[PDB]
Amino acid sequence: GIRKYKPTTPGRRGASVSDFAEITRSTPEKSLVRPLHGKGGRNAHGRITTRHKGGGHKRAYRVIDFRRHDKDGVNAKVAHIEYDPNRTANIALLHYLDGEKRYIIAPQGLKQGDVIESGANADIKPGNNLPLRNIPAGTVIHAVELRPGGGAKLARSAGVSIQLLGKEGTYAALRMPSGEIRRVDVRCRATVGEVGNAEQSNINWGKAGRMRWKGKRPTVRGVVMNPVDHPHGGGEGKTSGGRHPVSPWGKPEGRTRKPNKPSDKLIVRRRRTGK
RNA sequence: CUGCUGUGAAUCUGCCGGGACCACCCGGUAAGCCUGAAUACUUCCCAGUGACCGAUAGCGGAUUAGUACCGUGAGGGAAU
RNA sequence: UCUACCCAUGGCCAGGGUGAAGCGCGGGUAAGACCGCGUGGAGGCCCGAACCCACUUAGGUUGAAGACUGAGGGGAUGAG
RNA sequence: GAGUGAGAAUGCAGGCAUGAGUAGCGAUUAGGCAAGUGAGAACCUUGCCCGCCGAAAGACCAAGGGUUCCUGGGCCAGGCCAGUCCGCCCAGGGUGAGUCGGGACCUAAGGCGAGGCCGACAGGCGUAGUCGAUGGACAACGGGUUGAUAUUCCCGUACCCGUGUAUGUGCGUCCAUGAUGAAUCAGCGGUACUAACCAUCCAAAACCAGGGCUGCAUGGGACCUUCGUUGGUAGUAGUCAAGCGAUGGGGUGACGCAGGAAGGUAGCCGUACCGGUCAGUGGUAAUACCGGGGUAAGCCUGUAGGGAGUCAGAUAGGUAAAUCCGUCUGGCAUAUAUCCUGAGAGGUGAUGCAUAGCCGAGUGAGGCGAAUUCGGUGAUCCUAUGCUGCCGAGAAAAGCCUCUAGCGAGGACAUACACGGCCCGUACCCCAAACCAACACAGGUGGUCAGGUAGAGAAUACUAAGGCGUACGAGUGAACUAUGGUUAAGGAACUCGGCAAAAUGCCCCCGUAACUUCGGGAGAAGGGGGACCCACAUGGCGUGUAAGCCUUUACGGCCCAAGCGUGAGUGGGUGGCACAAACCAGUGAGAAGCGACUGUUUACUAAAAACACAGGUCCGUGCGAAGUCGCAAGACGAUGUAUACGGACUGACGCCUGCCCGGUGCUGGAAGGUUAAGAGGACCCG
RNA sequence: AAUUCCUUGUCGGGUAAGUUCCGACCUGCACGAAUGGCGUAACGACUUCUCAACUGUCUCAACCAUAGACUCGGCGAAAU
RNA sequence: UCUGAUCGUAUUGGGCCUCUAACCUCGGACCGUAUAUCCGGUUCAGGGACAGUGCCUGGUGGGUAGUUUAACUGGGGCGG
RNA sequence: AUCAGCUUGUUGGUGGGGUGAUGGCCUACCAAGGCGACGACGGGUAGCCGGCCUGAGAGGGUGACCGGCCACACUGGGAC
RNA sequence: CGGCCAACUACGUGCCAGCAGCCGCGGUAAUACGUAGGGUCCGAGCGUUGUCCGGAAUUACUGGGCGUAAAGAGCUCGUA
RNA sequence: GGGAGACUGGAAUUCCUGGUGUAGCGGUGGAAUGCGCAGAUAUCAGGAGGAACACCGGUGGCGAAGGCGGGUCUCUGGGCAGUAACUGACGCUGAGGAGCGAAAGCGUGGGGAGCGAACAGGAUUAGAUACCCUGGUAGUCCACGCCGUAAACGGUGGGUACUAGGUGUGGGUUUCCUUCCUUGGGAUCCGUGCCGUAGCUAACGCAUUAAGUACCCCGCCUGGGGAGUACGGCCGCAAGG
RNA sequence: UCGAAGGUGGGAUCGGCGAUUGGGACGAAGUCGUAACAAGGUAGCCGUACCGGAAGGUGCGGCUGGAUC
RNA sequence: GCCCGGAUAGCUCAGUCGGUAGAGCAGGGGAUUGAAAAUCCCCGUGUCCUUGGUUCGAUUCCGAGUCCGGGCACCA
RNA sequence: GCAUUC
Ligand SMILES: [Mg+2]
Ligand SMILES: [Mg+2]
Ligand SMILES: [Mg+2]
Ligand SMILES: [Mg+2]
Ligand SMILES: [Mg+2]
Ligand SMILES: [Mg+2]
Ligand SMILES: [Mg+2]
Ligand SMILES: [Mg+2]
Ligand SMILES: [Mg+2]
Ligand SMILES: [Mg+2]
Ligand SMILES: [Mg+2]
Ligand SMILES: [Mg+2]
Ligand SMILES: [Mg+2]
Ligand SMILES: [Mg+2]
Ligand SMILES: [Mg+2]
Ligand SMILES: [Mg+2]
Ligand SMILES: [Mg+2]
Ligand SMILES: [Mg+2]
Ligand SMILES: [Mg+2]
Ligand SMILES: [Mg+2]
Ligand SMILES: [Mg+2]
Ligand SMILES: [Mg+2]
Ligand SMILES: [Mg+2]
Ligand SMILES: [Mg+2]
Ligand SMILES: [Mg+2]
Ligand SMILES: [Mg+2]
Ligand SMILES: [Mg+2]
Ligand SMILES: [Mg+2]
Ligand SMILES: [Mg+2]
Ligand SMILES: [Mg+2]
Ligand SMILES: [Mg+2]
Ligand SMILES: [Mg+2]
Ligand SMILES: [Mg+2]
Ligand SMILES: [Mg+2]
Ligand SMILES: [Mg+2]
Ligand SMILES: [Mg+2]
Ligand SMILES: [Mg+2]
Ligand SMILES: [Mg+2]
Ligand SMILES: [Mg+2]
Ligand SMILES: [Mg+2]
Ligand SMILES: [Mg+2]
Ligand SMILES: [Mg+2]
Ligand SMILES: [Mg+2]
Ligand SMILES: [Mg+2]
Ligand SMILES: [Mg+2]
Ligand SMILES: [Mg+2]
Ligand SMILES: [Mg+2]
Ligand SMILES: [Mg+2]
Ligand SMILES: [Mg+2]
Ligand SMILES: [Mg+2]
Ligand SMILES: [Mg+2]
Ligand SMILES: [Mg+2]
Ligand SMILES: [Mg+2]
Ligand SMILES: [Mg+2]
Ligand SMILES: [Mg+2]
Ligand SMILES: [Mg+2]
Ligand SMILES: [Mg+2]
Ligand SMILES: [Mg+2]
Ligand SMILES: [Mg+2]
Ligand SMILES: [Mg+2]
Ligand SMILES: [Mg+2]
Ligand SMILES: [Mg+2]
Ligand SMILES: [Mg+2]
Ligand SMILES: [Mg+2]
Ligand SMILES: [Mg+2]
Ligand SMILES: [Mg+2]
Ligand SMILES: [Mg+2]
Ligand SMILES: [Mg+2]
Ligand SMILES: [Mg+2]
Ligand SMILES: [Mg+2]
Ligand SMILES: [Mg+2]
Ligand SMILES: [Mg+2]
Ligand SMILES: [Mg+2]
Ligand SMILES: [Mg+2]
Ligand SMILES: [Mg+2]
Ligand SMILES: [Mg+2]
Ligand SMILES: [Mg+2]
Ligand SMILES: [Mg+2]
Ligand SMILES: [Mg+2]
Ligand SMILES: [Mg+2]
Ligand SMILES: [Mg+2]
Ligand SMILES: [Mg+2]
Ligand SMILES: [Mg+2]
Ligand SMILES: [Mg+2]
Ligand SMILES: [Mg+2]
Ligand SMILES: [Mg+2]
Ligand SMILES: [Mg+2]
Ligand SMILES: [Mg+2]
Ligand SMILES: [Mg+2]
Ligand SMILES: [Mg+2]
Ligand SMILES: [Mg+2]
Ligand SMILES: [Mg+2]
Ligand SMILES: [Mg+2]
Ligand SMILES: [Mg+2]
Ligand SMILES: [Mg+2]
Ligand SMILES: [Mg+2]
Ligand SMILES: [Mg+2]
Ligand SMILES: [Mg+2]
Ligand SMILES: [Mg+2]
Ligand SMILES: [Mg+2]
Ligand SMILES: [Mg+2]
Ligand SMILES: [Mg+2]
Ligand SMILES: [Mg+2]
Ligand SMILES: [Mg+2]
Ligand SMILES: [Mg+2]
Ligand SMILES: [Mg+2]
Ligand SMILES: [Mg+2]
Ligand SMILES: [Mg+2]
Ligand SMILES: [Mg+2]
Ligand SMILES: [Mg+2]
Ligand SMILES: [Mg+2]
Ligand SMILES: [Mg+2]
Ligand SMILES: [Mg+2]
Ligand SMILES: [Mg+2]
Ligand SMILES: [Mg+2]
Ligand SMILES: [Mg+2]
Ligand SMILES: [Mg+2]
Ligand SMILES: [Mg+2]
Ligand SMILES: [Mg+2]
Ligand SMILES: [Mg+2]
Ligand SMILES: [Mg+2]
Ligand SMILES: [Mg+2]
Ligand SMILES: [Mg+2]
Ligand SMILES: [Mg+2]
Ligand SMILES: [Mg+2]
Ligand SMILES: [Mg+2]
Ligand SMILES: [Mg+2]
Ligand SMILES: [Mg+2]
Ligand SMILES: [Mg+2]
Ligand SMILES: [Mg+2]
Ligand SMILES: [Mg+2]
C-alpha cells in the first residue's frame, strides 16, 4: 500500500512513501550482488548525452534472471521478497531444489513460501514461466521475450502486464502495456501474472530533495534560456518560445520511429494517442 | 588528361591521336617494367670574400642566452 | 592546479529546543471509529558556534587587498 | 654608392628632472627600566616588571617549499628607520627504521591498452591485461640522549616475516594395520521382438428402400528379447589412511543514514600521605599557605556488552571434482547450556624507568631522592563494522578460512642456539615574513590534540601550559576625517526610505487572538520572579566504602551508616540606584503585492517578483527504443522496458481552466493537379 | 492592477495636512483562464503602507578617547 | 498482307506471392580461450533479395556557415 | 442551548482560628472530589406575597392603594 | 343611527372634499361624506387612545389536530 | 431478483481486418447540417471491447427503507408453517445518538461500446441561448472513500386488542370426497390485491392490510408571504446539508 | 496580609454608523418575452448537475398530484 | 503633427468602367385578425460631406477644406 | 409543420 506522511513540515506535506508491506528481508543475497556506479548521464567521451542525471544514492545491482530457461522441471520456493533500487518492481529470491538461488521480478500476489515451476509442463499460476506456445490465450503475462532465448524485455515495470490475445502459426499476438498490438514467436518465454508493487505510481515524492536522492537533476525550461542555448530562448519578459515547439536541438514535435523498420512486419497496430 | 559509379570491345580489314562530329589522309602502336647526365637544396665540415654591421647596430644571443625572468601550459623572452 | 557540472573514495557539522510515524497502556464499543497518558525520536524542523554564504551599512577607492576590512545579516542533518 | 639630416607619431631604449625632502613606513596587543655587548643600540643579549593570544597568536602533520635547520663568522646589498640582529651573506656540520608514512601487497573512479573492431591518411574506441589511494590487508611501546635526528640512535621490555644447524616427540612411502566398493556365471518377474487373446472405433467393396464380412487404428495381459531380483567367485585383484595444497569451487573480507540508552576509560576536581614557605602590612607557625600525590605496548585473566542451534542421511546446483557451500528430509535442543567476540577492572611488565624537592657548584653538568591512598566529576574517546529505527536501500580486490583437483617419500610440531630482514621519506617552516598571494602583503590553506573558573556550549569574559609584544619612532588637548563613548528637553519633526544608531535579548513560571492545509500561527501578544545569609536540612536526589544479608563462592547479587557531589522549593532576615548583575543575549504588532515552501543565480555594482522545486498536462519512444555524443565502430539512455525513458509548457494546495482548426505547425489519407534521375528513342540535323 | 495613457480618475478609510497605502466603483488607452485565471494557511536579509517601543536621524549641537592629520629625527615614492 | 478481334511459341519491361543461396541479426550453443557481455570462426534458430552501404536523383533543411540589408537629409530615425 | 460543559476553597476529611450559633465561614496540611440535558455554567428580564383584573371553570394577565416580608438610602468600600 | 348593533329621512358637494374597527362607503339622484330635522343608547358624564383578560376549543389539563387543508422524521437500531 | 465475492454465457450496438459490391446512405412534419464516391450504406466471414441482461416476467416474489432479474459456485441475513422440547414478562416505544440511505455530484486510480448535461453546427421562428436533426465532452461502468438529499409517497410513525362478508393471488399446514384423477371441496396460519357493511370523514374517500372502536411511546402542526432565507453554530474537499 | 477607586494589557460579548453591494415587499396605464393553468400547444412537479437576458432549457433518477388510447 | 483608409435613402451597408444610383430594416396604403404583433401584396424615399478644377458629361478622375476611423510622433 | 399578446 501507500503510507501518507503527516504535514509536519512544508517538505512533507502531501508526500507519501511505499508501506514496503511485501518486503520480507532487508538485505540482498551477497552472492547475487554486483557493483554499480553512477554515470551522471555521461558517455564514453565524458560528454553529457542524457541531461538531468547524477547525484543519486549509491546502489548495488541484483542479478535478475530474465532468461529462466535452464531449470525446466526443477521447482523453486519463494524464499524472500525484497526491495530493488534499480527498478520499480520488487524482486523475489527463489530457492531451487537444485540448491541454486536466483532473483526474479516479483509478480502480483506472489507470497513467501509459494512454489514456482518452469517449462512446458508448468501450471498456469502466477510466477510460473513457460513458452507462449503452452500459455492459453486470454491469460495475463509479464516479462516476455522478444526473440527465443533473448531474455525477458517487455512488461517488467511495477503493475504492468501483457494480454496474450491469440496464436496463429508461429506467432502469438500480444497487447502491450502501451496498447500496441504486436506479434512475437510462440517459442518465446513468458511469466504468468502481472508485475507486483502496482501502487508505487501513486507515491507523491513531496520535495525536490527526494528526486535528487533518486538521481534526477533539475530541468531548466527552454523559454528561460538565451537564443544561443535553446531555440525557445530569448525575448523580453515571458514568452511562449516564439515558434512551434522544438527540442533543444531544433527537432520539431513529431513521429520519431524510423520508417520501414523490420519490426514493422510484426506490429499489427500502433498505440492510440488521446483515446 | 584523370578519380569514383554503372555499362562494356576488337588483335592489324585491329585499335588510339591530329580541339565537337563524319569521311579521307597523316602520325603512333595503350592497357608490363627499369634507366645515368643536364635541374633543386645545405643541418653539418673546410678555404675564402664584402663601396656588409661595429655593442640601442649586427643573430634574440660579442658578456653563464634560448640563460635570468614571465606563464599551469603551449609559449614569450631580456640586460651587461 | 581558477571556475561550472559530474565520477570514485575519505572527512566534518559545539551546545540547546520541538516532539511525526510506530509501539505499549488505560478510557470507549457488540467489534470499531475515535479520545486521553506514556514510550518513541521523525524533519530539504527550530535557536545557535565551527564551517559554508555575501543581505544592509560605514571604511577602503596611487587600498593592508587587481574585490578586502569592521559592524550587524543568512544557511548551519542537507538539493549540506 | 647611400641604413644621408627629427621636435613632435598618447613613438622606442637609456639616463635624469617636476610633484618633494611631500604621501606613506601595512592593523584591530604596549611597552618600561636596569645591566651587558659594541665604533655606533627605541629595535641585539640577559634580568626584573607590564601587556596580549590561550578551539590560539599553543602543540603535531599532510600539500607545497628546498637547507630556510645547527655551530662559527659577517654587516657597503636586502629588512619600508637603525642594527652589534635576521627567515639576508659566507664556511663547515646536520636527516640513522623488519614495526612510523609509501613501494616490493590489493583493488575504486579513471588512465593506458597485446591481439581486435571501426576509420581515405591522421586517428577513434576497446577485450585480455596492466597501472591508478582519497579506501582494504599487514609486526612497537615507554624512557633517555645531541648544538642540530629519533616509535629511526641508546636503555628496558615486545611483536612480525624468512634462513641454517642441533635435540626431542609423535606421524610413513616398502614392510604392514584398518577400511571399504565393482565385473561376471547361475536360480527368479514385466519390458516385450513376434504369431495370436480381449474390449472398442471406422467402411473400401458395398446389399436394400437398416444388415454382414474383411482389413485399419487405439488401450490391457502374454512367448522371444532385454532390464531388473538373489546365490557363487570378487576384499581375488584394485582403491583409500603422513603431510603440502591451488591461478580452480565455496564462505568471509563487505560497508548507508539517523537515534539514543547503558557500561567504561582518558581528562579534570578534591583527599590520606609526603616535601616545603613566612612573601618586612591589622591578623596569621601550622590549624594557614605552596609544590608533589607518576609510569606504555606486550603478556596473563575473560567481566559489562554483542553474536550465534547441532548431528545424521541424500545431492552433482556451485563452467572438472568435493567430506566445503547451497538445497531437501530426519533425530536431539530452549538451557546464564556451550562456544565465538569484546570495552574496562585486576595481575604482570616495573628491585626498573620517571618525579616534588635537596646537595654543592655554574659552561651548566653531575649525584642523592619522599609520599604515591581513597573519593567525586566526566567525555565529541572506547565496547560499536554493536544495538534500535528508517528509505533514498548503502565499492572492489587482495588477504584469511575451507573444499577437493593435483602434488607426495619423506613429513608435521615443539624447544635451544646462530643468523637475514631490501628500496624511498625522515633536517626545518607548515593558519605562515619559509606554501598560494609580483612585497617580510589585514586575503587564502585539509587533518590531528582540546587545561581551569563562570557558562547549555568548541559561544563569551578572565586565565594555566605554551607562545607572543610582528621590524619606523618620539611628541603634541588645532581644524578636518576615521573608530568608539556620553547627552538636558523633545522623540522620526530627519530622509527617497527609521539609512545608521537606539531598543528587545537569559532562565523559571503565568498567559496567549484572527486565521488555518488542523501540522501550525507561537518565543504570538502581555505579565511576574531572579542577589547574598540563615533555617527547614545529620532532609531530598546521585554515587557508594565499612558493617550486614543472599548465593549459582566469583572479575557474583542485595542493602548500605560514613565520605564526596548536587539541585529545586518554602519561611525569615540582610545590602544597593540597580541582583539576567560585566561579557553574552529575539524588537513587537496591523495590512497589501509577488513567489507556495527549504534551496539556486550575474567570481568583481543586480540575490530578486528571476531559476529550481514537489504537483499537472501534452507529445515522442515496443527496445544495441526515442534522444544525445561520434565520419564510423561504439557509448550514454539502462545492466532500465510504457507505473519506463526523452522532450515541451505549467509550477504546493483549493475552486476552476470557456469559444475559434480560417492562418502556420504536427498527425493521418491519397481521388484529382503538378513533379527528378532512370527507362524509352518517333521525328529531325551533320 | 508589478497592467489605467488621460490621472493626483471618483467615492470611502487612515493623517492637523496622504500624487504613496488600504476598501470600493468600471469610462479594462492596452486583464483573463496551464507564455494558466482567481484565491490561499505557512514561509521571505523581496517590495509597499500604518502603529507601539526606542533613540543625536532630526530641532541643534556639545564634550571625551584613540588612529591619521600637525611638530621633530630616519627612510622615502606617485599620478601630472 | 492491310480497317480490326484473337490465341500459343520467343524477346522484353511493371506489380504481386513465395523460395534460399548473397546479405543481415546486440537471438542460442560451441571453439580460438587458463583468463574474455571485445573480436573472429563453426553451427543451430530467425529475417531476406528487403534492409544496410556506393553512385546518380527530387524533396525537407536558421540545425549550421558565408554574407547582404542604398543614398539624399538644416544630427539621425520616421515621412518624402 | 443560535448558552454544553462548569468548578481548585472547588468537593470531602483532620488539627487550629472565628461566631451568639452550625458550617470552607477562615486557615494549614491530606484525599480527588462536587454540580450538569430532572438544563449545570452563561445571557435577558424582574423585588416576592396576601391579593387584584378577567374568566363558566381550568386558566391567562398583574402586584397601584391597603397589609406582611426583603432590598437600598449621591456612587463604591469599611468598620465603630 | 349600512351590517354586527338599538336608532332614517331631506339638502350640500360626485372617486373630490372626506369616512372607516372589519367588510367596505364618495364617479352630479349617498339611510356610510358634511350639515339639518328626527331617532337611539348612556347621563354629570359621554366618547377616543393605550393596556390586560374574554369572545379565541386560536397552545385545546378541562378542551384541537397531522391521506388530499399547516402537520408522520427517508428507513432502522438503540441510550436516558 | 434479500446481501457480498469470484468465475463465466449468448443476442445486439460500435470499431477493426478481409471478401462481394456499387452510388448513394442517413435523417424529418418537411428539410438541412452529417457520412460517402479516396470505395459508404448493404451483405458475408474473422477479430477486439464495453455496457445491459430479450423470452420467463405479473399491478407475482424478497428486503427496514433506499432497493433487488443471464448462469454457476462460495460465504451470509431475514421470513413463514408445524411441534410445544426450553427460558419465564426477559415486553413495547424511544428525546438525544449511531448505522443504512435512489439519482445527481465530489476525490484518487482504472475503464469507456452504447447513451449523453455542457458544447458545436442544421432546421424551425419575429427571435429560438429550446422542442426536432447531425455530432459530441464530463458523466453513466469498475475499485476505494466522501456527500446524506428525492413527489426517499400509501403524500397515511411504531406496538397491541377488537369490530358483516364476498372474491382473486403468493407461502405453509391439515379433514372430507375419492377416481384417489386432483385448481375436488372444507378448516386453519402467514403475506399480497380488488369489492363492499357497520363506523368514520368537509367532501373525495377509508373500510379486519382502517382514515373504524380503544390503550402505550415517539415525531410533527398552530394564517399566507418574507423563509427552510439571514445571522450564529455544527458537518463537508466542494457543491451544499 | 486582605482591600475600594485608579493605571496597564490582551481578549469576550451587545449594539450604532459605513463608500460599495445582496436580495425582499409594495407601487400607475413602462420594456422584453410567454414559463405555468386545457394534452397550456415539449404533461407537470421533486432531488441534483450544467447552461441561458428573463421566465426557463437539457441530462440522470423519481412521483401522478398526467390528458388521449 | 506624419502616413493611410473613409464620408451614398430615416438607420446599417453594396455599387464605380466618366453615361447607373441599388439591398435588408424602417416608413406609407392595402390584405389577414374581434383587435394588436408576426406574416402576405402594392408604393414612396438620394448636392452620393463640402469645395473648386479637368471633361460634351463627375457618386466615379484630380487638388483643397470640415468631420471620423486606423498605424505612427522616436535616440540621447 | 407552425399559431405571441389583450
Ligand atoms: Mg573512458
Ligand atoms: Mg529530463
Ligand atoms: Mg525498487
Ligand atoms: Mg509520479
Ligand atoms: Mg524546470
Ligand atoms: Mg535570462
Ligand atoms: Mg537558434
Ligand atoms: Mg511582454
Ligand atoms: Mg503517454
Ligand atoms: Mg579525337
Ligand atoms: Mg619509374
Ligand atoms: Mg659606444
Ligand atoms: Mg644586441
Ligand atoms: Mg595565461
Ligand atoms: Mg615556472
Ligand atoms: Mg533546518
Ligand atoms: Mg556564490
Ligand atoms: Mg582615501
Ligand atoms: Mg562579517
Ligand atoms: Mg542575531
Ligand atoms: Mg534570523
Ligand atoms: Mg541557525
Ligand atoms: Mg534526519
Ligand atoms: Mg635615416
Ligand atoms: Mg633627439
Ligand atoms: Mg621623446
Ligand atoms: Mg626631486
Ligand atoms: Mg604638497
Ligand atoms: Mg602634509
Ligand atoms: Mg604623514
Ligand atoms: Mg609594521
Ligand atoms: Mg643602555
Ligand atoms: Mg620596537
Ligand atoms: Mg587576556
Ligand atoms: Mg637560524
Ligand atoms: Mg644562522
Ligand atoms: Mg653571530
Ligand atoms: Mg646593513
Ligand atoms: Mg637599513
Ligand atoms: Mg579499469
Ligand atoms: Mg583504449
Ligand atoms: Mg594495437
Ligand atoms: Mg599499484
Ligand atoms: Mg591511502
Ligand atoms: Mg628539532
Ligand atoms: Mg555487498
Ligand atoms: Mg605580620
Ligand atoms: Mg592494565
Ligand atoms: Mg618512589
Ligand atoms: Mg622533525
Ligand atoms: Mg613570499
Ligand atoms: Mg600574511
Ligand atoms: Mg574551556
Ligand atoms: Mg573565543
Ligand atoms: Mg611582518
Ligand atoms: Mg608604529
Ligand atoms: Mg585631537
Ligand atoms: Mg537626548
Ligand atoms: Mg532624557
Ligand atoms: Mg517626515
Ligand atoms: Mg522634511
Ligand atoms: Mg514620502
Ligand atoms: Mg537598521
Ligand atoms: Mg545597536
Ligand atoms: Mg503573527
Ligand atoms: Mg533599598
Ligand atoms: Mg521564493
Ligand atoms: Mg529555516
Ligand atoms: Mg531562501
Ligand atoms: Mg555581482
Ligand atoms: Mg550583491
Ligand atoms: Mg513530470
Ligand atoms: Mg538510435
Ligand atoms: Mg506542447
Ligand atoms: Mg512559470
Ligand atoms: Mg503532411
Ligand atoms: Mg489614485
Ligand atoms: Mg482620499
Ligand atoms: Mg486599490
Ligand atoms: Mg497576459
Ligand atoms: Mg485555454
Ligand atoms: Mg495559455
Ligand atoms: Mg504563475
Ligand atoms: Mg536573500
Ligand atoms: Mg596622534
Ligand atoms: Mg619627517
Ligand atoms: Mg534495396
Ligand atoms: Mg546566420
Ligand atoms: Mg570574407
Ligand atoms: Mg545617410
Ligand atoms: Mg531631418
Ligand atoms: Mg523612410
Ligand atoms: Mg473545629
Ligand atoms: Mg428593577
Ligand atoms: Mg374560556
Ligand atoms: Mg337595528
Ligand atoms: Mg384559550
Ligand atoms: Mg384579543
Ligand atoms: Mg384545528
Ligand atoms: Mg395519527
Ligand atoms: Mg399538506
Ligand atoms: Mg414514512
Ligand atoms: Mg464489488
Ligand atoms: Mg469493407
Ligand atoms: Mg459491414
Ligand atoms: Mg428502538
Ligand atoms: Mg430521533
Ligand atoms: Mg451515482
Ligand atoms: Mg465538476
Ligand atoms: Mg468519478
Ligand atoms: Mg476518472
Ligand atoms: Mg455513508
Ligand atoms: Mg426532505
Ligand atoms: Mg421510491
Ligand atoms: Mg414526507
Ligand atoms: Mg396505528
Ligand atoms: Mg389476507
Ligand atoms: Mg371499500
Ligand atoms: Mg382524516
Ligand atoms: Mg416561505
Ligand atoms: Mg440553508
Ligand atoms: Mg452561515
Ligand atoms: Mg450603505
Ligand atoms: Mg406556455
Ligand atoms: Mg408545457
Ligand atoms: Mg411551443
Ligand atoms: Mg400539466
Ligand atoms: Mg441547452
Ligand atoms: Mg425523466
Ligand atoms: Mg528610451
Ligand atoms: Mg407585451
Curated annotation (Swiss-Prot):
Gene Ontology MF annotations: rRNA binding; structural constituent of ribosome; transferase activity
GO biological process, one term: cytoplasmic translation
Region listing for Disordered, in residue ranges: 1-19, 24-57, 222-275
Similarity comment text for this entry: Belongs to the universal ribosomal protein uL2 family.
Quaternary structure, from the entry: Part of the 50S ribosomal subunit. Forms a bridge to the 30S subunit in the 70S ribosome.
Known function: One of the primary rRNA binding proteins. Required for association of the 30S and 50S subunits to form the 70S ribosome, for tRNA binding and peptide bond formation. It has been suggested to have peptidyltransferase activity; this is somewhat controversial. Makes several contacts with the 16S rRNA in the 70S ribosome.
Name of the protein described by the UniProt record: Large ribosomal subunit protein uL2
